[PDB]
């Protein structure tokens, strides 16, 4: 969502999000670092192709044609420069000139040193408490985004980790149709479609980058939770990692984990969908967690088996029509977990990524809330690892990522919503070590 420089009436009125970098002659002189060679302000490139019929409300939702309902001029940086103002480097590059190559390694959380485990956890909690230096977050839709006077932007500061939650919520929220209207729910800009894996990849990349700037530790990397153990229990659910069960309320996190102190954001859906407002930075309840806890559906009371990862990784097509949660022989739909691990669709089956979510039977098992549980990071870095193994084995075959008629938000050239600057699914559909500056220390079945 948007840089605090662009959360102004001037930027919103002119639809131009092109903040200065180093304005030495005065304001406006170095938009996108044009004075240096770093980039230029220019038109926003948005997807123009058709989406599936499932969404009938074109013209009504600000996530259509993202980000054009807010801005149509943005930064484009040259070469390997990057950033909302071209002030940083593309993933994998560092140095003032973005010419020094960088590669970090994401390891299994359970292989980290006791000092690195403590570090990761203190880093997360610091993320949860630290104001995000760049991004501010909308509380109203674009109709209302400049306040009743048209001069008060409807934005709040938000923490580094609450922004990670908020974007995920904003990618998934119902489309508001009007007070007394039933908000429209057959849309998902980050799930149930091919953009799933690329959306969550960029989601995790942005957190990692943010936590690197927060810690001032360029080599900081996100660990992963290997959940394909077929375990009855959640082996990262201990007071030195993520937190174990609270002995006083079995659905809460142990008071001897700092994650028992976290307060979630974005759980007031009925406010959002009846008033036409957005999730803001006011937190409320505590995390709920209850691994293997949903007695009603035994299918989600055990984590994915190792052979699930093995099997989904032999599904050789990235996706298949209708490019939705009912797609068969789709690796994307399989690892997401609406298909069984062989690729066979079943409306009754939940597997791999979705099974891991529902196994927590709590905040992490609800789509609008789940990043509130920090297991989400590790659940999703492991997912991105699986993805990144698939990109390795099938030579990053993007030919199956459909250029048109996917669910709205999931066509290849769609700017993943609501990431800023605009970034398409294509820019993520690359092998991580040589294109994104990170790699996974990880061993697969056979």
Ligand X SMILES: *[C@@H]1O[C@H](CO[C@@H]2O[C@@H](C)[C@@H](O)[C@@H](O)[C@@H]2O)[C@@H](O[C@@H]2O[C@H](CO)[C@@H](O[C@H]3O[C@H](CO)[C@@H](O)[C@H](O)[C@@H]3O)[C@H](O)[C@H]2NC(C)=O)[C@H](O)[C@H]1NC(C)=O
Ligand Y SMILES: *[C@@H]1O[C@H](CO)[C@@H](O[C@@H]2O[C@H](CO)[C@@H](O)[C@H](O)[C@H]2NC(C)=O)[C@H](O)[C@H]1NC(C)=O
Ligand Z SMILES: *[C@@H]1O[C@H](CO)[C@@H](O)[C@H](O)[C@H]1NC(C)=O
Ligand U SMILES: N[C@@H](Cn1ccc(=O)c(O)c1)C(=O)O
Smallest gap from residue 119 Cβ to ligand U (A): 26
Smallest gap from residue 287 Cβ to ligand Y (A): 11
Residues 29 and 420: their CA atoms lie apart, in Å, by 22
User: Which lies closer to Zn ion via its Cβ, residue 76 or residue 90?
Assistant: 76
The 3-state DSSP class for residue 256 equals coil
Count of positions on this chain that bind ligand X (CB under 6 A): 7
CA 232, chain centre distance (Å): 27
Residue with tokens 């690359």: 430
- Out of 5, 15, 45, 342, point to the residue binding ligand X (CB under 6 A): 15
Reading the block at residue 14, the tokens are 């002119």
CB under 5 to 8 A by kind: which of Zn ion, ligand Z, ligand U, none does 157 bind?
Answer: ligand Z
14 binds ligand X (CB under 6 A): yes
Residue 225: closest CA among 364, 70, 347: 364
CB under 5 to 8 A by kind: which of ligand Y, ligand X, Zn ion, none does 3 bind?
Answer: none
Rule CB under 6 A: which of 365-384 touch ligand Y?
365-366
The 3-state DSSP class for residue 378 equals helix
The 3-state DSSP class for residue 70 equals coil
Kindly give the residue spans of alpha helices, DSSP state H, lying in 41-176.
Answer: 114-129, 160-170
- Out of 85, 198, 320, 370, point to the residue binding ligand U (CB under 6 A): 370
x/- letters, 7..36, toward ligand Y (CB under 6 A): ------------------------------
The angle formed by the CA atoms of residues 314, 315 and 316, to the nearest 5 degrees, is 95
Residues forming contacts to ligand Z in the complex (CB under 6 A) are 4, 7, 136, 155-157, 322, 324, 326
CA 1, chain centre distance (Å): 12
User: Which lies closer to ligand Z via its Cβ, residue 131 or residue 232?
Assistant: 131
The single-letter DSSP state of residue 72 is: S
CB under 5 to 8 A by kind: which of ligand Y, ligand Z, Zn ion, none does 24 bind?
Answer: none
User: Which lies closer to ligand Z via its Cβ, residue 3 or residue 371?
Assistant: 3
Residue 168, annotated ligand binder? yes
Smallest gap from residue 367 Cβ to ligand Z (A): 18
CB under 5 to 8 A by kind: which of ligand X, ligand Y, ligand Z, none does 72 bind?
Answer: ligand X
- Out of 57, 60, 76, 174, point to the residue binding Zn ion (CB under 5 A): 76
Q: Half-sphere exposure of 231 toward its Cβ, with a 13 Å CA cutoff?
A: 13
User: Which lies closer to ligand X via its Cβ, residue 12 or residue 207?
Assistant: 12
45 binds ligand X (CB under 6 A): no
Residues 66 and 42: their CA atoms lie apart, in Å, by 16
The single-letter DSSP state of residue 284 is: -
Residue with tokens 């006011």: 282
- Out of 31, 173, 350, 410, point to the residue binding ligand U (CB under 6 A): 350
Smallest gap from residue 12 Cβ to ligand X (A): 7
Contacts (Cβ under 8 Å, ≥6 apart) of 397? 318
Q: Half-sphere exposure of 383 toward its Cβ, with a 13 Å CA cutoff?
A: 30
Kindly give the residue spans of alpha helices, DSSP state H, lying in 234-372.
Answer: 269-275, 306-312, 331-336, 352-359
The single-letter DSSP state of residue 438 is: E
Please give the full DSSP string across 142-163, using - where no structure is assigned: GGGTT-TTS-S--EEEEEHHHH
CB under 5 to 8 A by kind: which of ligand Y, Zn ion, ligand Z, none does 76 bind?
Answer: Zn ion
User: Which lies closer to ligand X via its Cβ, residue 13 or residue 344?
Assistant: 13
- Out of 274, 277, 367, 413, point to the residue binding ligand U (CB under 6 A): 367
- Out of 52, 108, 139, 159, point to the residue binding ligand Y (CB under 6 A): 139
Residue 57, annotated ligand binder? no
User: Which lies closer to ligand Y via its Cβ, residue 137 or residue 428?
Assistant: 137
Classify residue 128 by burial, with Cβ atoms within 10 Å: 0-12, 13-18, 19+. Answer: buried
Reading the block at residue 317, the tokens are 């097509």
- Out of 45, 72, 405, 426, point to the residue binding ligand X (CB under 6 A): 72
* Feature table: binding site for Zn(2+): 168, 191, 200, 353, 357, 380
Which stretches of the chain bind ligand Y, using CB under 6 A? 139, 268, 271, 277, 280, 282, 290, 293-296, 361-362, 365-366
């Amino acid at each position: 969502q948007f840089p605090r420089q662009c959360a102004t009436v001037e930027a919103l009125r002119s639809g131009m999000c092109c903040p200065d970098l180093s304005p030495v002659s005065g304001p406006g002189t170095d938009r996108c670092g044009s004075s240096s060679g770093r980039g230029r302000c220019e038109a926003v490139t948005a997807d123009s192709r058709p989406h599936s019929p499932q969404y009938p409300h074109d013209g009504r939702d600000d996530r259509e044609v993202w980000p054009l309902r807010f801005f149509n001029r943005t930064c484009h940086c040259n070469g390997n420069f990057s950033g909302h103002n071209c002030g940083t480097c593309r993933p994998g590059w560092r140095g003032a000139a973005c010419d020094q190559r960088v590669l970090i390694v994401r390891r299994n959380l359970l292989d980290l040193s006791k000092e690195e485990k403590n570090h990761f956890v203190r880093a997360l909690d610091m993320a949860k408490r630290t104001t995000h230096p760049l991004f501010v977050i909308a509380t109203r839709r674009s109709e209302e985004i400049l306040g009743p006077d048209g001069n008060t932007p409807q934005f709040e500061n938000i923490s580094i980790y609450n922004y990670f939650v908020w974007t995920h919520y904003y990618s998934v929220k119902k489309t508001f149709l009007g007070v007394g209207q039933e908000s429209f729910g057959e849309v998902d800009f980050s799930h149930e479609g091919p953009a799933f894996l690329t959306w969550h990849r960029y989601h995790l990349l942005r957190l990692e980058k943010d936590m690197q700037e927060m810690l001032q530790e360029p080599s900081f990397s996100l660990p992963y939770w290997n959940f394909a153990t077929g375990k009855n229990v959640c082996d990262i659910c201990t007071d030195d990692l993520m937190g174990s069960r609270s002995n006083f309320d079995s659905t809460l996190i142990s008071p001897n984990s700092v994650f028992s102190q976290w307060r979630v954001v974005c759980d007031s859906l009925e406010d959002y969908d009846t008033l036409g407002t957005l999730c803001n930075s006011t937190e409320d309840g505590p995390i709920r967690r209850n691994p293997a806890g949903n007695v009603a559906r035994p299918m989600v009371q055990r984590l994915p088996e190792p052979q699930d990862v093995a099997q989904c990784l032999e599904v050789g097509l990235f996706d298949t029509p209708p490019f939705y949660s009912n797609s068969t022989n789709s690796f994307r739909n399989t690892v997401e977990g609406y298909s069984d691990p062989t690729g066979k669709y079943d409306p009754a089956v939940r597997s791999l990524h979705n099974l891991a979510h529902l196994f927590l039977n709590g905040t992490g098992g609800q789509t609008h809330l789940s990043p509130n549980d920090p297991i989400f990071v590790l659940l999703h870095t492991f997912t991105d690892a699986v993805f990144d193994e698939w990109l390795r084995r099938y030579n990053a075959d993007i030919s199956t990522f459909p250029l048109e008629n996917a669910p709205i938000g999931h066509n290849r050239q769609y700017n993943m919503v609501p990431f800023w600057p605009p970034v398409t699914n294509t820019e993520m559909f690359v092998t991580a070590p040589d294109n994104l500056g990170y790699t996974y220390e990880i061993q697969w079945p056979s």
